[PDB]
Design a protein around this nucleic acid. Structure first.
Ligand SMILES: Nc1nc2c(ncn2[C@@H]2O[C@H](COP(=O)(O)OP(=O)(O)NP(=O)(O)O)[C@@H](O)[C@H]2O)c(=O)[nH]1
Ligand code: MET
Ligand SMILES: [Mg+2]
Lengths: 253, 80, 22, 409, 69
RNA sequence: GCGGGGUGGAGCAGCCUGGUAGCUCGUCGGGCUCAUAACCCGAAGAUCGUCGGUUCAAAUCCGGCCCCCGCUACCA
């Protein structure tokens, strides 16, 4: 994912990948900046073996850009979790794209640098995430491509070459006094956790458990961050309702 | 068990010198209610100040004796 | 004043009437 | 399932739990981590099998596992019964639970410490509680003789043989032990195989039982698909429960309406029956059981329905708020280091009324010769007319056993 | 090393080992499977159940759980 | 085995961003008030756990032990 800049603007947030775990930090590579290797120290981290992994692609904020030597430091603490989702959808977009040029260029036998220079940098102009100036393109026409002046070589090879976990959880409370209460719990949970796999669709796994005696935890894990509470809330809603429509009291913390 | 306490004189307003009580486990002991009870024993004003109780005037012995009455270990209490 | 007294009288009454009721 | 309920009363740290450990093997955990630095805090629990070496000599003949080849020889010792214990605590303040616990006992064993001044506060407090409630099948035990002079343990046996005099305790034998090196325990098994006989219980009677624990089995994290039911721990006394019966809990949960109070009975189905770690289809007196239920485990987490009782659904039992006690006092307060003489009851006084397993607080409305009328915070389900009770007063901050009587309806 | 026992209770170790090392390994055997943890008596039994063996002191009465092997 | 912490008498800052040790419990001096408090200013006190290392300079950065505290939350 070639960049139209040398160094990321400091304080910026982006997707990078852990390259090399050393003792006093590790080297990462900012996937949005031609894999621009940078430096990440423990004073910015925090079971640490699954995010300090060899290749899992983390997200971070740029603590320091020394434009001089050409080195960069980042942190993953300093990443708001309100940033951590938005810039987590932006990811799945920016990688649909990657794939596209990663196969068109190849097909066209050229360069992903000339696939990113040409296709993606001028479709930067026409206000937009280029993958959407192509989602209008493939639907509408190749004249959305030619407008911005996208070298009419990729155009068609583009169009035709056109057509993973996140965890979210919640503390609930489920009281009951019914003679066969446990049972009704199992029920309302298995009726409020129903057809959800298709409603707020394809996610990965959902887990409901007791961590207090009335306090519980629901756990939606998925592929698209902003599919999170979408699923989750809905579930938690239908808890209440069906809980509230089957004599079992339920209430979010 | 194991709850120690310190009772000593603490500068205050009109009168002479307040009384400070510290060392209670605030997760188990409600200082608001303790203070209210102590204020009745001393018949003085007082407040919970952070994790301590401050009483107006010198009531060190009064407070210590009342705390023992309330079930707190005699040996956990020191008057300074 | 009569605020005072009314609630003092009431509290006396209640507390004592609590002690009579009990 | 265990036949009988033997209690292990006594002063603090004399080793009650330890003696239970030499007999069964079991510890009471000492848990909540607190108990692990402190001592027994909930009633401990443990069971064991007593067989006998017919084919050899006693007391050693008194075995613990189907194995005689430990003394004399092989012939697989004959099984006499399986018993259960109830380890109380010993601390002057856990009085309110130990009381509670007695309600399940069919007999007891008084663990005195061989290396500390015989009538120690709680030792007595307990003893008289025992002679008061009715637990007349008693065995005194001289524990820490593994740390004393061969003179000392005999002279204590004297002070004991002399206390055990005027009192109701004729030939309540006294078996010195070493709970630490498990020495002489087999003669203890022979005592408890003689004197603590297993009482008959008419089953036909109304199914009635006392509760003293209850847990949320469910592990931190078990999914909802297999949330195992609410679980009620306690002891049966009269009747017998069976898997799949319809049951209720009394007085049961109270509601809240703007400062009001209102208890009411909980119904459920006996999901399951277990003694020790092994499951049974039915359950009969003597022992503690645990009852798997179908009710929201919230309802019985920490030990909520403590002091509650379980009976036949659609059964006739009073949930009183106000009660008629007939009654008597001790002349002394055997339980303070000080023996100060018991002041007679003044009305409008708060007293702990220990009824059955439950522990409730209440205020005195009536003061006659031996019939007072009490008003209670939490209701008492009075299952019989024969309801023994135990009465206490906050003497010096800590509560103290002062007298008794009989519930009256 | 391999070996079995005489019909007359003798141990024949199919290997010529130094008298010493035998003891060293033997005491280690005592430590882990015979000696009581509580008091060190050596006057013990050795229970066995599904998968848990225990040392059982005839003096102190305690049970040192040992790795069934 | 991990990781947090030893700073005037007590209880807490300051340390990854090396040169300035800050805050509350009473003391002492001077103000304000007719006077007491309160409030204000000025004063007493710290080998910063120890044995050394790097540096111009170490409370501060790197290692060596000595006590102090916690570790992924407990069982019919
Ligand atoms: N030397 C010796 N020590 C013993 C003996 N019995 C118990 N102890 C010791 O006494 C201590 C107290 O054990 P514990 O059983 O908790 O006492 P307890 O009386 O059960 N506590 P609680 O009164 O609360 O139930 C243990 O540390 C044990 O080592 C004995 O016969 N000899
Ligand atoms: C601690 S309750 C005692 C018996 C019970 N079945 C157990 O488990
Ligand atoms: Mg104990």
């Amino acid at each position: 994912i070639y960049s139209r800049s040398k160094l990321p603007s400091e304080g910026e947030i982006l997707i990078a990948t852990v390259k090399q775990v050393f003792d006093y930090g590790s080297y990462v590579s900012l996937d949005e900046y031609g894999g621009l290797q940078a430096f990440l120290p423990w004073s910015e981290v925090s079971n640490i073996r699954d995010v300090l992994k060899e290749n899992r692609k983390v997200i971070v904020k740029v603590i320091r850009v020394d434009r001089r030597k050409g080195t960069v430091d980042v942190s993953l603490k300093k990443v708001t979790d309100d940033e951590r989702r938005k810039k987590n959808l932006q990811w799945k977009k920016i990688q649909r794209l990657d794939k596209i040029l990663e196969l068109v260029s190849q097909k066209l036998k050229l360069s992903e640098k000339d696939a990113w220079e040409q296709v993606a940098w001028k479709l930067e102009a026409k206000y937009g995430d280029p993958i959407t100036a192509i989602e209008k393109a493939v639907k509408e026409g190749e004249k959305i491509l030619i407008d911005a002046g996208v070298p009419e070589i990729w155009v068609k090879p583009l169009l035709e070459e056109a057509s993973r976990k996140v965890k979210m959880s919640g503390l609930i409370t489920v009281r009951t006094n019914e003679p066969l209460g446990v049972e009704k719990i199992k029920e309302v949970i298995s009726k409020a956790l129903e057809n959800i796999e298709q409603d707020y669709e394809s996610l990965l796994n959902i887990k409901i458990y007791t961590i207090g005696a009335p306090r519980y935890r629901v756990d939606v894990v998925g592929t698209n961050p902003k599919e999170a509470s979408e699923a989750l809330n809905q579930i938690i809603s239908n808890l209440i309702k069906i809980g509230k429509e089957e004599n079992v009291d339920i209430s979010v913390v | 068990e194991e709850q120690k306490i310190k009772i000593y004189v603490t500068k205050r307003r009109f009168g002479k010198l307040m009384t400070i009580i510290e060392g209670f486990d605030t997760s188990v002991i409600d200082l608001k209610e303790l203070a209210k009870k102590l204020k009745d024993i001393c018949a003085c004003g007082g407040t919970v100040k952070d994790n301590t109780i401050e009483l107006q005037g010198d009531h060190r012995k009064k407070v210590a004796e009342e705390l023992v009455k309330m079930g707190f270990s005699r040996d956990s209490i020191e008057i300074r | 004043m009569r605020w005072k007294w009314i609630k003092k009288r009431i509290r006396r009454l209640k507390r004592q009437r609590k002690k009579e009721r009990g | 399932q265990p036949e009988v309920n033997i209690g292990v009363v006594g002063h603090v740290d004399h080793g009650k739990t330890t003696l239970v450990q030499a007999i069964t093997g079991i510890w009471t955990s000492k848990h909540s981590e607190e108990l692990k630095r402190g001592m027994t805090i909930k009633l401990g629990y443990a069971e064991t099998n007593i067989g006998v070496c017919e084919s050899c000599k006693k007391p050693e003949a008194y075995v613990t596992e189907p194995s005689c080849k430990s003394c004399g020889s092989d012939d697989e010792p004959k099984f006499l019964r399986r018993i259960s214990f109830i380890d109380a605590p010993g601390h002057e303040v856990l009085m309110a639970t130990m009381l509670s616990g007695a309600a399940l006992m069919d007999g007891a064993i008084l663990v005195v410490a061989a290396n500390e001044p015989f009538p120690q506060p709680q030792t007595r407090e307990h003893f008289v509680a025992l002679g008061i409630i009715g637990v007349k099948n008693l065995i005194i035990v001289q524990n820490k003789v593994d740390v004393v002079s061969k003179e000392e343990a005999l002279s204590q046996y004297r002070q004991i043989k002399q206390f055990t005099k005027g009192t109701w305790a004729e030939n309540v034998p006294i078996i010195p032990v070493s709970a630490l090196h498990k020495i002489n325990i087999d003669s203890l098994i022979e005592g408890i195989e003689e004197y603590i006989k297993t009482p008959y219980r008419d089953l036909s009677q109304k199914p009635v039982m006392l509760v003293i624990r209850s847990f949320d089995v469910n592990k931190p994290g078990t999914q909802f698909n297999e949330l195992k039911g609410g679980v009620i721990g306690g002891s049966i006394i009269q009747g017998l429960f069976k898997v799949d019966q319809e049951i209720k809990v009394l007085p049961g949960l109270r509601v809240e309406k703007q400062g009001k109070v209102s208890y009411e009975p909980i119904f459920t189905k006996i999901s399951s029956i277990r003694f020790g770690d092994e499951e049974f289809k039915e359950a009969k007196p003597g022992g503690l059981v645990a009852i798997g239920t179908y009710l929201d485990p919230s309802l019985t987490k920490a030990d909520n329905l403590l002091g509650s009782i379980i009976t036949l659904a659609d059964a006739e039992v009073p949930v009183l708020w106000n009660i008629r006690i007939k009654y008597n006092l001790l002349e002394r307060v055997v339980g303070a280091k000080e023996m100060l003489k018991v002041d007679p009851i003044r009305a409008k006084e708060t007293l702990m009324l220990s009824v059955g397993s439950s522990t409730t607080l209440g205020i005195v409305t009536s003061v006659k010769k031996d019939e007072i009328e009490v008003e209670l915070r939490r209701p008492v389900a009075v299952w019989s007319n024969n309801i023994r009770t135990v009465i206490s007063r906050q003497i010096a901050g800590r509560w103290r056993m002062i007298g008794w009587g009989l519930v009256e309806i | 090393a391999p070996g079995n026992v005489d019909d007359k209770g003798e141990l024949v170790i199919q290997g010529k080992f130094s008298s010493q090392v035998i003891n060293t390994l033997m005491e280690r055997f005592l430590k882990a499977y015979v000696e009581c943890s509580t008091c060190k008596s050596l006057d013990t039994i050795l229970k066995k159940e599904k998968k848990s063996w225990y040392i059982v002191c005839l003096a102190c009465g305690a049970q040192t759980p040992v790795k069934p092997l």
